[PDB]
Design a protein around this ligand. Structure first.
Ligand SMILES: *[C@@H]1O[C@H](CO)[C@@H](O)[C@H](O)[C@H]1NC(C)=O
Length: 935
């Protein structure tokens, strides 16, 4: 801490008045600007030298809504904003004069923090020097930059008046930021084509060398097409401090030694500022009837803006409200959003509309394998899996939790929620749904290692499943390999051994327990097993264990060499007995340890269990089967006549194979799964038979759908140094939006028909710097130039009272042909409103021509001829066809009036009425009103 680093005296508080105005727009062309006024009363407490405390009160924000005179009022966000302002005090350290440190409140919101940082950034003032003009590297809210120590005027010894420049394009913290761009998406070139600087002045006092009053202003101009770097899309932000009083030890130390460097905060608006998002969808409802699809691309841009500023909680809460107005537009908006929450949304909608839940589970299973998990998506996939519990859902969740743990080893509460949900699923000892219990065991046998640090009950519950034989034998076994990927604890190993020595235990169960234990072998257990085996009765498990002993003793791997030596030392008293025929005896073929396990009931010889390993735990192949020995004995144990009748009498075949790769159980298939597949094919056949029924809905007609497809081809949005503290983001979006409004409504029996689907294309170059205060206010003006073309025709053919009138409806809305030229819009936090176009020098040219009787092919435009175009001002270029009113529309009418006066009239109804009429008897009339050849 230098002797005279600061120009302030401790034990002398400072009552200052902070102000700021974030004006934005195009100078010269007009004067109406998008500005967000803000002011507050700042209490600077001074515990000691180079130690400060910040308090603030009466932080009132004012919003521009009119001119005569910048009309200002109080926002609905202002009160809670000031509440956050006065919620906490701040601590400031500036040791050594250069090093500056922030001590914030731990719970103080980060945007509030950087707001305060921006406020205090201008508060720094560098001590005087002999040179009136100087340039020094000084830190700001965005790190060290080149300040300009320029004495406005000096009293020789002192200079109360002073000025400083900081060209913001030369700041250390000038780095841009990542943004929630469209997934189908240039930073430094954008920095080049923009301006960023501050230039301002300050007033000290001669009496006490304290800043009397300071004022700062900045410039942020879209350089291309700008006029002498002084006109065009510019953002000028103010920051003014006004002293009011300097009233009258301990300094509050903060644990977080935060730096004055700006912290990136995602631009956002609260539900109060995000209420109109539903109206943001209602707007494209208007083109349902208004059909003026020129602004549809701009509407989609508004959608992009609101979703970027949206909150996950709100959107998740009101997704059905989003989707109700029209599903596919909402879906494509979510796709193009580029925001993580969108990923969660659609499937939540999907199950909400029963849109083939089978493929819903399929796609969720597909997406759960991503290596970039999110907690909210984990919660919702857990919820949906609990909902339907299909194989795909459970496998998806099983892989997703492992992926999340691998990516994020840090534990979270949702993992505990999943764990207790699972232990509820198994209840006490896995007495629930047999196949569901099997599937959830297959699940847990993958991430129980991840959850090992979470709940010790994991083992305690599942051993209850292991010990209790109330569940069926298959689930009984599955309880063991639920622990297969689990590290056996001492209690686990003891329970395993106690269940293991049971002779009434099935041979496969005992062997599986043996394998699970020998995962972590114990010398005493091996000794007792070796001493028991000579009197062992189950021959096939004896062959299996002898094979396993041979595998370990002959394991050439040095990793198993020590274990082989230990087993040889144990078996020195007596070696293992003879090995049986591996062709027809249960034996472990632990062949890089590839293990073959063909185990059967000692009564029979067909291996009920066929396990194959591969090795990390590369691949695991298993299969448990039963009910096939009677099938074999059907002929093995003239015949065909009795066999055909005996087919149904055979015991029900029962098989279930499974595959687990990299620990995670990939999936299993059983004969029950096979008949499930048969039922699924039956459902598919029903769906295929449903199309004859669907043709009724097809012919029901009476519909109109605005198939408009949006896209963003350029997405380069970021954040750059904001002098106003409130973030200066940068939005750049080129948006295309073609599409047609197609719908069916007719009546064949009534002889009714019409034409639909006029297609059109729109373009939006939404580009500026976003002067937006996250959750508080938004200001600025993006470039608004639209390249729109209109095409397609609509007709209407009907028949009534025998009059076959074939109407050619000229639309009430004149049909456009091409649109071009800029039409800008002052964008406010509440609602953007059209920027008024220029008047002088805007040649209001309008070339029209009644090319066809009743219709006018016309075009018009205006632009002033001093920024380069289109920054010069509003530009118009519109070519279209408009009804002249003399003909409201055309219609070809015909009625078989027997006399027969079968009229054939091409009436062009309207103020004028031209028609070719044909009535034949033979009355050969040929009427042409235009040339008036009315034969
Ligand atoms: C000032 O800029 C210099 C350039 O040498 C740099 O070393 C220093 O860290 C900067 N100071 C701050 C406070 O950013």
């Amino acid at each position: 801490c230098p002797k005279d680093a600061t120009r302030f005296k401790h034990l002398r508080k400072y009552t200052y008045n902070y102000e700021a105005e974030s004006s934005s727009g195009v100078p010269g062309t007009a004067d109406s600007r998008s500005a967000t006024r803000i002011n507050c009363k700042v209490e600077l407490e001074v515990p000691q030298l180079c130690s400060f405390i910040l308090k603030t009160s009466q932080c009132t924000l004012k919003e521009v809504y009119g001119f005569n005179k910048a009309l200002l009022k109080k926002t609905k966000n202002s009160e809670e904003f000031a509440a956050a302002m006065s919620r906490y005090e701040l601590k400031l350290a500036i040791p050594e004069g250069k090093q500056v440190f922030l001590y914030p409140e731990k719970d103080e919101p980060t945007y509030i923090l950087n707001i305060k940082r921006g406020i205090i950034s201008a508060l720094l003032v560098p001590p005087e020097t002999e040179e009136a003009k100087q340039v020094l590297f000084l830190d700001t809210v965005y790190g060290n930059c080149s300040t300009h120590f320029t004495v406005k005027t000096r009293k020789g010894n002192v200079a109360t008046e002073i000025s400083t420049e900081r060209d913001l394009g030369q700041c250390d913290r000038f780095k841009p930021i990542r943004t929630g761009i469209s997934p189908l998406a240039m930073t430094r070139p954008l920095s080049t084509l923009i301006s960023s600087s501050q230039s301002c002045q300050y007033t000290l006092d001669a009496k006490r060398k304290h800043v009397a009053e300071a004022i700062c202003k900045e410039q942020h101009l879209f350089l291309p097409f700008s006029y002498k770097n002084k006109y065009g899309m510019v953002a000028q932000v103010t920051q003014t401090l006004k002293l009011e009083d300097t009233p009258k030890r301990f300094f509050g130390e903060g644990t977080k030694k935060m730096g004055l460097a700006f912290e990136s905060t995602k631009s956002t608006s609260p539900p109060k500022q995000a209420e109109a998002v539903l109206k943001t969808l209602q707007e494209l409802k208007k083109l349902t009837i208004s059909e003026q699809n020129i602004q549809r691309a701009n509407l989609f841009n508004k959608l992009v803006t609101e979703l970027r500023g949206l909150s996950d909680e709100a959107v998740t809460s009101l997704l059905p409200q989003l989707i109700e107005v029209s599903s596919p537009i909402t879906l494509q908006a979510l796709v193009q959003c580029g925001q993580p929450q969108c990923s969660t949304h659609i499937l939540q909608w999907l199950k909400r509309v029963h849109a083939n839940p089978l493929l819903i589970d399929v796609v969720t299973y597909l997406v759960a394998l991503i290596p970039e998990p999110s907690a909210q998506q984990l919660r919702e996939i857990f919820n949906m899996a609990r909902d339907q519990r299909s194989r795909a859902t459970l496998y998806a969740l099983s892989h997703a939790v492992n992926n999340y743990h691998k990516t994020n080893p840090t534990g979270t509460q949702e993992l505990l929620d999943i764990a207790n949900y699972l232990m509820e699923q198994i209840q006490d000892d896995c007495t629930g749904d047999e196949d569901y219990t099997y599937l959830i065991l297959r699940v847990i046998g993958n991430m129980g290692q991840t959850m090992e640090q979470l709940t010790p009950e994991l083992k305690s519950s599942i051993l209850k499943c292991v010990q209790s034989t109330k569940p069926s034998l298959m689930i009984q076994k599955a309880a063991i390999q639920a622990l297969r990927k689990m590290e056996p604890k001492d209690k686990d190993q003891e329970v395993l051994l106690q269940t293991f020595l049971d002779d009434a235990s099935p041979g496969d169960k005992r062997l599986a327990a043996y394998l699970m234990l020998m995962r972590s072998p114990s010398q005493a257990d091996i000794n007792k097993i070796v001493q028991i085996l000579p009197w062992e009765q189950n021959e096939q498990v004896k062959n299996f264990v002898a094979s396993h002993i041979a595998n370990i003793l002959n394991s050439e791997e040095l990793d198993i060499q020590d274990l082989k030596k230990l087993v040889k030392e144990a078996l020195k008293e007596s070696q293992l007995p003879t090995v049986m025929d591996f062709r027809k005896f249960s034996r472990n073929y632990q062949l890089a340890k590839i293990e073959g396990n063909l185990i059967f009931d000692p009564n029979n010889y067909l291996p009920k269990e066929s396990m194959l390993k591969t090795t990390a735990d590369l691949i695991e192949i298993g299969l448990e089967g039963k009910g096939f020995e009677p099938t074999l004995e059907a002929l093995f144990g003239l015949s065909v006549e009795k066999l055909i009748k005996d087919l149904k009498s055979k015991e029900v075949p029962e098989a279930r194979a499974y595959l687990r790769i990299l620990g995670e159980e990939l999936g299993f298939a059983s004969l029950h799964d096979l008949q499930l597949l048969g039922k699924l094919l039956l459902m598919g056949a029903r769906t295929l038979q449903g199309i004859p029924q669907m043709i009724g809905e097809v012919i029901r007609k009476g519909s109109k759908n605005d198939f408009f497809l949006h896209y963003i081809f350029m997405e380069n949005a970021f954040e750059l140094p904001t002098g106003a503290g409130l973030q200066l983001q940068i939005s750049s979006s080129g948006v295309i939006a073609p599409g047609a409004k197609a719908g069916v409504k007719l009546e064949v029996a009534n002889m009714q028909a019409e034409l639909v689907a006029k297609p059109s294309v729109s373009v939006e170059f939404v580009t500026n710097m976003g002067i937006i205060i996250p959750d508080f206010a938004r200001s600025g003006v993006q470039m608004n130039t639209n390249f729109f073309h209109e095409s397609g025709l609509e007709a209407h053919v009907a028949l009534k009272a025998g009059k076959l009138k074939f109407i050619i409806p000229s639309p009430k809305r004149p049909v456009k042909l091409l649109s071009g030229g800029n039409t800008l819009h002052l964008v406010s936090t509440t609602k953007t409103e059209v920027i008024p176009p220029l008047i002088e020098n805007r040649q209001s040219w309008s070339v029209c021509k009644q090319v066809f009787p009743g219709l006018n092919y016309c075009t018009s435009g205006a632009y002033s001829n001093a920024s380069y175009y289109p920054l010069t001002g509003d530009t118009r270029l519109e070519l279209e066809l408009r009804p002249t009113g003399e003909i409201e529309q055309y219609s070809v009418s015909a009625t078989y009036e027997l006399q027969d006066t079968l009229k054939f009239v091409t009436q062009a109804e309207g103020a004028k009425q031209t028609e070719a009429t044909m009535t034949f008897k033979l009355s050969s009339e040929v009427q042409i009103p235009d040339f008036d050849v009315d034969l």
